C-alpha cells in the first residue's frame, strides 16, 4: 500500500488555505501521480479537487519515499483567485494562452 502523512499544517486565513509538508511512503513502486495524491488529500480534508494544489515531489535516494509541499484552499473560487496560472492549467482549471 501507500501512505500519505502531512506535517507543519499551517492554516493561512489571508490566502485562505492550508499549506503543509506532504511525505509519501511508497514501497515497491515507482511514485504517486499528483492527480492521485490530490485525490487522497481531498478525501482526507473534505475539500474539492479543484481546491487542492500539490507540488514539488522529490524521491529520496534509494526510493520508497518522497517529500513535497501541498496547499488546500478554503474554497474552489479562492483556489482560482490565488493559485498561479500555470498551477491552475496543469489541473485543467485554466486553458493555455
Amino acid at each position: 500500500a501507500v501512505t500519505i502523512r502531512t506535517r507543519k499544517v499551517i492554516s493561512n486565513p489571508l490566502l485562505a488555505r492550508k499549506q503543509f509538508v506532504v511525505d509519501v511512503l511508497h514501497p515497491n513502486r515507482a511514485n504517486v501521480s499528483k492527480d492521485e495524491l490530490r485525490e487522497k488529500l481531498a478525501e482526507v480534508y473534505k475539500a474539492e479537487k479543484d481546491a487542492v494544489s500539490v507540488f514539488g515531489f522529490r524521491t529520496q535516494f534509494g526510493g520508497g519515499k518522497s517529500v513535497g509541499f501541498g496547499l488546500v484552499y478554503n474554497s474552489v473560487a479562492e483556489a482560482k483567485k490565488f493559485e498561479p496560472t500555470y498551477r491552475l492549467v496543469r489541473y485543467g482549471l485554466a486553458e493555455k494562452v
Partner: protein, 31 residues
C-alpha cells in the same frame, strides 16, 4: 585547558528577544 580556552574564544567571537522566534510563533499560531 586548551579545549576550554578555545570555548571562551568562540563565546567572545560569538530586552532579550529574537526576531525569528517571533516569526516562528505567528507561524505556530498560524498552525
Amino acid at each position: 585547558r586548551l579545549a576550554k580556552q578555545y570555548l571562551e574564544n568562540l563565546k567572545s567571537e560569538a530586552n532579550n528577544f529574537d526576531a525569528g522566534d517571533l516569526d516562528k510563533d505567528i507561524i505556530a499560531s498560524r498552525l
